[PDB]
Design an enzyme around this catalytic site. Structure first.
Site: not given
Ligand code: HEM
Ligand SMILES: Cc1cc(N)nc(C[C@H]2CNC[C@@H]2NCCNCCc2cccc(F)c2)c1
Ligand code: HEM
Ligand SMILES: Cc1cc(N)nc(C[C@H]2CNC[C@@H]2NCCNCCc2cccc(F)c2)c1
Ligand SMILES: C[C@H](O)[C@H](O)[C@H]1CNc2nc(N)[nH]c(=O)c2N1
Ligand SMILES: C[C@H](O)[C@H](O)[C@H]1CNc2nc(N)[nH]c(=O)c2N1
Ligand SMILES: [Zn+2]
Lengths: 407, 411
Positions: B108, B111, B280, B285
């Site tokens: 993430c 964070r 947000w 994304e």
């Molecule tokens: C506040 C604005 C936030 C932004 C801009 C943001 C941005 C992102 C981005 C760009 C990713 C990469 C996932 C992807 O591109 O596929 C990500 C992953 C992730 N985010 Fe954040 N996030 C935010 C809030 C949060 C919140 C509130 C949580 C939980 C309380 C969180 C937990 C996670 C987790 C657990 C992943 C890993 C997802 C995965 O492995 O599939 N995020 N986030």
């Molecule tokens: C809370 C929050 C905010 C923002 N901005 N962004 C996020 C990440 C999610 C939104 N935009 C993409 C991402 N989540 C997409 C799916 N995540 C799992 C990835 C995946 C796929 C297949 C197999 C796997 F093992 C893992 C979360």
């Protein structure tokens, strides 16, 4: 034991068995991944030699044959006698092609078996190295139709008699610190440039000054040599749409030639092994030109494009980035100098991985390095799972000679 | 054991000690790196030490380590575990745990925001209808008419693994995908399988390009039930381009609230299998992945055509050119409609500051470079040049299998 890698765009799944033959360590542990860290005796030499000969003799389908066993005995005797040994020409060429084949950070490996190997193990002096290097440069350049090559100087002995090219690449531009405080030319080469001046080099003090070669033969102090200008192919950088682009004064050289790495084959260490291929466009257009600590031309370019530079959210940097990279590719192609774009290079690398998985049981690949520095997810490698591991023969980093050398 | 990480652009060197606390495994070994692999019923036996580590962390965070209140809490939890085979978190502990799971989320980039998370305790929920109500409230709160606020809603923890609460949706708001007999897909190809399940469960599909999926909610291990989120609660943004007037005619829109609903929250050994959370968007994304992945909406060609790009050779970089234009459009459209969004330059710059802060105050910041680096313009963002260390800390968010794969149907 058997590890699977998946491509999330195509669902193609490959099975890796080749990792089981890895000996060297990665930096990672069960508790930590160091995947994004840039840098993570008679007794010692024999298993290394044996491991190498076994893979060699297996490659020519003569594993467990007489020629195989014989070579092993012959080496064993030379090791027990001299404390080292000498590679056959055939083993040197195999070892070099395989070090490229095993380079997990290299996207260009589809080409691995078409490497011209220049044996310079008979070299004794810096003038001799200069000669071998000029010859390598001209052969590889081939009037713009680039051919991959490596020149291999004598292997390490006691460690006080090492051959080294002090340049990081055979052809690179000078960097100078300024009264202003800024930097003229390439900031990556400020320190090397100073050493060259410290050695007596008369610096033209321009933006794109081809650096001299600084060559160390057999542990001696290094010597300066100017590469003949007619051997250094350069490309002026213009844009297919923008008539002003040429006015930025940009150019780059056609031949990427890494000269500071160490080639390890069967425990023998080749500390001077300059090798060269041809560029992927992004190396120049993204990294060389747009890294903040490099030529850093983003501001200038976006200025000429009359972009909105007020807010990062107009993506002015991204827009300029793309035009610059179009320009680099357009220029090299227009001058008939070999170059590959990141779409084509990454497509080929996927085909290569596929070939390697079915033919060899795997392909060590470092995703952090393979994915281009622009447009990552629009290239197929972004969506490709990769397993990174260290196979030998290999190319390794080694310390910059100026921190080691005793004058 | 102290580990250094360097930024190669600024030469700033940081020292990680936090990784020593890490218990869980990465997938890598001394001989192989699995850094680019997407995916590399607990007994009393294992539960109390998991509870202890967590409460030790919690009581240290509040500066009450070794206090009477600390000791009494450990005894009370130990007693509750021996008596009931599980335990209940205090509200304060649940809040701390949820915030830490985000703080610990190595993939993430967002964070910097971790300490501002609104936590909604839904552990008194008992039915799917109750879930739907909790989820509507989360969406309304988080949405805040465009001024998005981060939130998480936490349903009751796993008990025997046969009474799981689950949100079957991968995100709370997502668009349907429909496979046609000619083999083309209408809408989002990522959601074809889930869309099929919804239709089978009785959803009447409008069969358009951007149909908001209904919620499919499972309480207490029961069969899941369908619910339509009130449309007035779903904020969407029509996508247009500040310069290209024809962009609007592509018919693109996206939703404003990214809300992941299929992960598992682990806190002190307890497993919250339904814990939808939201933040947000970062523009890429939507603009890079959702719109331009070959396996998603795949609009690169159509955009490139309308820009009259030279599409005869990849080396014209027509894909790259269109890609940037689409991402300009996404950001422009969100900002014009006053819906919170962050671009990849700002978000990555903020992440480096966050990471430096974490190393200074916490001794480390686990980060997954493969995921942190944006999917366009990698090296023009400062994270590209930042060495990172990836390791697993708890509390954590974890993946779990899609529930259609595991659910026991009752009928
Ligand atoms: C506040 C604005 C936030 C932004 C801009 C943001 C941005 C992102 C981005 C760009 C990713 C990469 C996932 C992807 O591109 O596929 C990500 C992953 C992730 N985010 Fe954040 N996030 C935010 C809030 C949060 C919140 C509130 C949580 C939980 C309380 C969180 C937990 C996670 C987790 C657990 C992943 C890993 C997802 C995965 O492995 O599939 N995020 N986030
Ligand atoms: C809370 C929050 C905010 C923002 N901005 N962004 C996020 C990440 C999610 C939104 N935009 C993409 C991402 N989540 C997409 C799916 N995540 C799992 C990835 C995946 C796929 C297949 C197999 C796997 F093992 C893992 C979360
Ligand atoms: C023929 C065309 C070639 C192409 C397009 C190519 C491309 C690349 C690229 C893009 C990189 C990453 C470097 C960076 O981005 O900074 C790389 C790294 C590397 N290449 Fe290749 N290469 C080619 C030929 C070769 C040859 C001939 C060799 C050796 C025989 C080689 C060995 C290596 C090694 C060892 C690395 C990693 C170097 C490091 O860690 O800095 N390459 N190559
Ligand atoms: C042979 C060949 C052909 C092509 N096209 N391309 C290449 C890669 C080289 C050119 N472009 C950069 C790269 N060689 C530079 C190697 N290291 C620089 C980064 C670095 C800095 C400090 C410490 C480190 F560990 C690493 C080789
Ligand atoms: C910190 C990080 O490992 C470093 O910036 C790497 C990332 N990926 C790279 N990839 C390539 N091809 N070349 C590089 O120099 C780097 N730099
Ligand atoms: C194979 C590879 O690990 C996979 O495509 C990853 C790469 N990096 C990513 N980074 C983010 N933020 N999101 C992703 O879905 C992915 N996909
Ligand atoms: Zn690793």
């Amino acid at each position: 034991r058997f590890l699977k890698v998946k491509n999330w765009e195509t669902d193609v799944v490959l099975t890796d068995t080749l990792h089981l033959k890895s000996t060297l360590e990665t930096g990672c542990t069960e508790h930590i991944c160091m995947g994004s860290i840039m840098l993570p005796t008679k007794d010692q030499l024999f298993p290394l030699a044996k491991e190498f000969l076994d893979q060699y003799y297996s490659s020519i389908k003569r594993f467990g044959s007489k020629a195989h066993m014989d070579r092993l005995e012959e080496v064993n005797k030379e090791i027990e006698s001299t404390s080292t040994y000498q590679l056959k020409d055939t083993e040197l060429i195999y070892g070099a092609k395989h070090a490229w084949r095993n380079a997990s950070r290299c996207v260009g490996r589809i080409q691995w078996s078409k490497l011209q190997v220049f044996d310079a193990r008979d070299c004794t002096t810096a003038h001799g190295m200069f000669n071998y290097i000029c010859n390598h440069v001209k052969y590889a350049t081939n009037k713009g139709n680039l051919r991959s090559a490596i020149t291999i100087f004598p292997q390490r002995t006691d460690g006080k008699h090492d051959f080294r090219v002090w340049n990081s690449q055979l052809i690179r531009y000078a960097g100078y610190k300024q009264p202003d405080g800024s930097t003229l030319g390439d900031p990556a080469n400020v320190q090397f440039t100073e050493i060259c001046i410290q050695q007596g080099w008369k610096a033209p003090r321009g933006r794109f000054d081809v650096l001299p070669l600084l060559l160390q033969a057999n542990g001696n102090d290094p010597e300066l040599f100017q590469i003949p200008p007619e051997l250094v192919l350069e490309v002026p950088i213009r844009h297919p749409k923008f008539d002003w682009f040429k006015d930025l004064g940009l150019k780059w050289y056609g031949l990427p030639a890494v000269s500071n790495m160490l080639l390890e084959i069967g425990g023998l260490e080749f500390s001077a092994c300059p090798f060269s291929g041809w560029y992927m466009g992004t190396e120049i257009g993204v990294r060389d030109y747009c890294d903040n600590s490099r030529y850093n031309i983003l501001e200038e370019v976006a200025k000429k494009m009359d972009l909105d530079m007020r807010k990062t959210s107009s993506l002015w940097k991204d827009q300029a980035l793309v035009e610059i990279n179009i320009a680099v590719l357009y220029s090299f192609q227009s001058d008939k100098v070999t170059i590959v774009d990141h779409h084509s290079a990454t497509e080929s690398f996927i085909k290569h991985m596929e070939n390697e998985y079915r033919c060899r049981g795997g392909c060590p690949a470092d995703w952090v390095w393979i994915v281009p520095p622009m447009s990552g997810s629009i290239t197929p490698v972004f969506h490709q799972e990769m397993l990174n591991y260290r196979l030998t023969p290999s190319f390794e980093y080694q310390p910059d000679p100026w921190n080691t050398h005793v004058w």
